[PDB]
């Protein structure tokens, strides 16, 4: 099979064995990358969520021809516009994307998260998500979008500004069938990781989406599938794992890009579709949006 992980936090210190500035185990990032390559991951989109993190994502993406990155400001970080001067901050994000055309493939992560108002209030989130359509309009890059507990406001901004972006994906989607149908009507794609598959209602929503509008991702080291999640029973491929780090083993409770196969197994069993046929469609959809040239 072949995969493109549209949302992988490859810069996370967990992949270097680092926990709050402390070396807990040997840096195993290259081993993590190697396990993902072995299962068929061909490209990795390393997510950026503010100016500095987008620079960090780009700097890691420059280390390997399989790696790419995004530039944008996550809803939880949108206080950085007023802190730094909003027009300067926007221009810094714009320059970072425009000067790095090979590696930067999307504007984002951006959108809304009304379960995280303690990090950035609603008004600031709405204002600065909408402002980022200046980045998509100028760069002609597709968007990598976030929506939690905010469909109505998210749809309003996206629908009003649809002609200001070439396309995009609503990643780690966890909304209703009506929300998914409204997003597909705007010619947007729907991304699934483990966090999109936790409930029985999430599985039913997945069934309602045409396969030509789906993408796949892990959000590793987060969103690992747990037995309490509705789709866990469908996972078939396991990896050697240890609770205390050991060479050649995954670390218990740390998700990795290789675990994208488990997301594929869930999606294909839920939809009653051949696993490779669905994997190939997901790959082709991702190329069309993020790698068409």
Known binding residues are 109, 146, 171, 219
Find all residues with CB under 8 Å of 156, minimum gap 6, and list them.
none
Say whether residue 243 binds Ni ion (CB under 5 A): no
Please identify which residue in 176, 232, 280, 284 interacts with Na ion, judged by CB under 5 A: 232
Nearer to Ni ion, 240 or 292 (CB): 240
Q: Which segment (185-193, 211-219, 235-243, 264-272) binds Ni ion by CB under 5 A? A: 235-243
Structure token digits, residue 95: 């320059």
Please state the length of the chain.
Answer: 293
Residues 15 and 30: their CA atoms lie apart, in Å, by 9
Q: Residue 102 binds what, of Ni ion, Na ion, none (CB under 5 to 8 Å, by partner type)? A: none
CB atoms within 10 A of CB 20: 6
Nearer to Ni ion, 88 or 238 (CB): 238
Q: Which segment (31-39, 135-143, 221-229, 265-273) binds Na ion by CB under 5 A? A: 221-229
Which residues contribute to the annotated binding site for a divalent metal cation? Answer: 109, 146, 171, 219
Helix axes of 122-131 and 151-160: crossing angle, nearest 10 degrees: 30
Q: Residue 240 binds what, of Na ion, Ni ion, none (CB under 5 to 8 Å, by partner type)? A: Ni ion
Residues 160 and 60: their CA atoms lie apart, in Å, by 34
Please identify which residue in 140, 240, 292, 293 interacts with Ni ion, judged by CB under 5 A: 240
Nearer to Na ion, 64 or 232 (CB): 232
Nearest alpha-carbon partner for 145 in 283, 11, 47, 267: 47
Distances (CA, A) of 190 to 94, 174, 181, 217, 262: 25, 10, 10, 11, 18
The contact set with Na ion (CB under 5 A) reads 227, 232
Residues in contact with Ni ion by the rule CB under 5 A: 240
């Amino acid at each position: 099979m072949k995969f493109i992980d549209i949302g992988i936090n490859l810069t996370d210190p967990m992949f270097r064995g680092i926990y709050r500035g402390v070396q807990k185990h040997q840096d195993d990032l290259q081993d993590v990358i190697g396990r993902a390559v072995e299962i068929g991951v061909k490209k990795f989109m390393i997510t950026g969520g503010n100016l500095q993190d987008s620079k960090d994502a780009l700097h890691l993406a420059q280390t390997n021809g399989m790696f790419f990155s995004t530039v944008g400001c996550h809803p939880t970080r949108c206080g950085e516009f007023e802190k730094n001067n909003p027009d300067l901050y926007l221009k810094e994000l714009l320059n970072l994307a425009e000067n790095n055309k090979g590696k930067v493939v999307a504007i984002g992560e951006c959108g809304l998260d009304f379960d995280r108002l303690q990090f950035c209030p609603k008004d600031t989130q709405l204002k600065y998500f909408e402002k980022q359509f200046e980045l998509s309009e100028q760069t002609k890059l597709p968007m990598f979008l976030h929506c939690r507990n905010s469909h109505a406001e998210f749809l309003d901004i996206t629908k009003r500004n649809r002609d200001r972006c070439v396309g995009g994906v609503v990643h780690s989607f966890d909304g209703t069938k009506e929300a998914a149908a409204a997003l597909i009507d705007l010619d947007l794609y729907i991304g699934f990781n483990g966090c999109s598959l936790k409930t029985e209602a999430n599985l039913e929503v997945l069934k309602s989406i045409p396969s030509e509008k789906l993408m796949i991702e892990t959000d590793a080291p987060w969103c690992g599938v747990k037995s309490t999640h509705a789709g866990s029973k469908y996972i078939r491929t396991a990896f050697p794992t240890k609770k205390k780090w050991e060479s050649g083993h995954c670390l218990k409770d740390r998700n990795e890009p290789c675990h994208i196969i488990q997301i594929l197994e869930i999606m294909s069993a839920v939809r009653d579709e051949d696993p490779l046929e669905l994997a190939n469609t997901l790959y082709n959809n991702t190329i069309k949006v993020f790698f068409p040239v």
